Amino acid sequence: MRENNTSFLVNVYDLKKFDTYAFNKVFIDDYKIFWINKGSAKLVDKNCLVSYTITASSVVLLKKNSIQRFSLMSLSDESISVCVLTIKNKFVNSLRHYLQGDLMIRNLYNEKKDLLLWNCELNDISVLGEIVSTYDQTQYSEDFLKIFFSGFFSKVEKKYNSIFITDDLDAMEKISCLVKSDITRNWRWADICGELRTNRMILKKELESRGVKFRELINSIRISYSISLMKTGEFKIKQIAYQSGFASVSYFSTVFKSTMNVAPSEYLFMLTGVAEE
Ligand SMILES: CCCCCC/C=C\CCCCCCCC(=O)O
């Protein structure tokens, strides 16, 4: 029996005609890129107060460890499919140490942009479409894709003077890794700074730049954790809530609905296509 893909996750979601998805403080737990298959949609980035029209030749890149606030609204008179490619941590590591030589200008890039737009050449459209076409690819060696994505992320970074793939000494990565190492623990802000051996200073900068309080950040990480659990095959809402560190199903559901603008059971239906029972 062939095995699940170790480098990527592919999830496709139906965007009904003229409907809107709205995300409020969603934590991006891994690097993600997404695109629509046909038609057009309006993307409103509420972090930057910038609006974009995307088409089938656009790809939107979401930075790991960012907190996103945006909406996506279908502009088409037909159902649209949103394809979300998650790049897994094992694979991103390979990318950090792949590109030959030292890129001299990258030290003067900045980290201000967490949502990036790229208008694809058909080269890119071909490769991305084949990746998501079927669970295995086979015709795409892992090395081919490592070369492709390191070159792909390189040119997006150069369009924006911005670091997309960060080093793993990043303070926000250390925080989110620590929280997820014990997701049901009642984390306190002073405990995290203590265990990371970094005072409540450079760490506070990470909350401020994302516009969240500590308790908001923990809730956002826990929602992203619950979505990861649902993707593993866990479909019992009580188990999803408790394993993600929520005190009750009621509160999980309220936070989930505030973050994703749909109820947990609705998201489960979008994910699996199976209505309950
Ligand atoms: C938060 C990233 C979603 C980007 C794509 C938005 C398009 C359709 C909304 C359905 C997806 C809802 C969140 C998906 C969760 C995930 O796959 O990580």
Author numbering: 1 to 277
Cite, word for word, the article reporting this structure.
Toxigenic Vibrio cholerae causes disease by producing the primary virulence factors cholera toxin (CT) and the toxin coregulated pilus (TCP). Most AraC/XylS-family members, including ToxT and AraC, contain an N-terminal regulatory/dimerization domain and a C-terminal DNA-binding domain. We present here the crystal structures of the V. cholerae master virulence activator ToxT in both the UFA-bound and apo states. We have presented here the results of structural and functional studies of ToxT that reveal the detailed molecular basis for the regulation of virulence in V. cholerae by the UFA components of bile or synthetic ToxT inhibitors.
We solved the 1.8 Å resolution crystal structure of wild-type ToxT from V. cholerae serogroup O42 strain SCE-256 (ToxTENV256). The asymmetric unit is composed of a monomer of ToxTENV256 in a closed conformation. ToxTENV256 and ToxTEPI are superposable, with a root-mean-square deviation (RMSD) of 0.432 Å for 204 α-carbons. The N-terminal regulatory domain contains a nine sheet β-barrel with three α helices on one face. The C-terminal domain is entirely α-helical and contains two helix-turn-helix DNA-binding motifs. As with ToxTEPI, ToxTENV256 purified from E. coli with a UFA bound within the hydrophobic pocket inside the end of the regulatory domain β-barrel, at the interface between the regulatory domain and the DNA-binding domain. Tyr13, Lys32, and Lys231 in ToxTENV256 are analogous to Tyr12, Lys31, and Lys230 in ToxTEPI. When aligned to the structure of the AraC dimer, helix α3 of UFA-bound ToxT is at an angle that precludes dimerization. The recognition helix (α6) in the first helix-turn-helix motif in the DNA-binding domain of UFA-bound ToxT is turned perpendicular to the recognition helix in the second helix-turn-helix motif (α9), which prevents it from fitting within the major groove of DNA. These results suggest UFAs inhibit both dimerization and DNA-binding of ToxT by controlling the positions of α3 and α6, respectively.
